[PDB]
Design a protein around this ligand. Structure first.
Ligand SMILES: CCc1c[nH]c2ncnc(N3CCC[C@H](Cc4nc(C)no4)C3)c12
Length: 167
């Protein structure tokens, strides 16, 4: 038993809700919140900009130190950093950005990072400003992630299309 509420169960291990991941995060304090990161961990907009703003820019300060030490992430890769006031940990995962021409097949690799964590609060990778089809992202998610994932979908209209179209 865990503390997530109001989710619809899609599969054995994947759940979905219409929710603001920031507000969902501040209420659950999950062990892991996933950030929709880029390779530079520049949290300017989308999910990342929202999570970072909610941390009072502390996520960005920590991220800049991480990059200065380690260099950029790989597309499809991830790193674990602090969750600040939102979660114990933030898993920054780099899905491919279609608006940069990155290979959508890397989306499966991106979701594989979720399997290193037993339970996660997460957005749909490569959705939103990353330019992928969210219906496809949900499919790859269901077919790749084996751990328990609670997907927060900000847009109510999108949430309903994803549920109604889910096979
Ligand atoms: C500000 C956006 C936001 C606020 N609060 C949220 N809560 C859940 N999801 C959210 N996003 C919508 C946009 C796309 C994003 C997915 C994705 N961005 C990139 C790059 N690649 O994928 C997810 C949000």
């Amino acid at each position: 038993v865990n503390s997530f509420s109001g989710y619809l169960k899609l599969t054995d291990n994947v759940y979905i809700k219409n929710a603001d991941i920031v507000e969902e995060a501040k209420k659950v304090k999950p062990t892991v919140v996933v950030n929709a990161a880029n390779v530079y961990l520049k949290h300017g907009g989308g999910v990342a900009g929202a999570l970072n703003k909610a941390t009072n820019n502390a996520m960005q300060v920590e991220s800049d130190d991480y990059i200065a030490t380690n260099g950029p992430l790989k597309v499809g890769g991830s790193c674990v950093l602090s969750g600040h006031n939102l979660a114990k940990h933030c898993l920054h995962v780099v899905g491919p950005n279609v608006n940069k021409g990155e290979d959508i097949q890397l989306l499966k690799s991106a979701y594989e990072n979720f399997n290193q964590h037993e339970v996660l609060l997460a957005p749909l990778l490569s959705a939103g400003i990353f330019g992928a089809d969210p219906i496809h992202s949900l499919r790859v998610c269901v077919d790749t992630v084996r751990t328990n994932v609670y997907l927060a979908v900000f847009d109510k209209n999108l949430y309903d299309k994803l549920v109604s179209s889910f096979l």
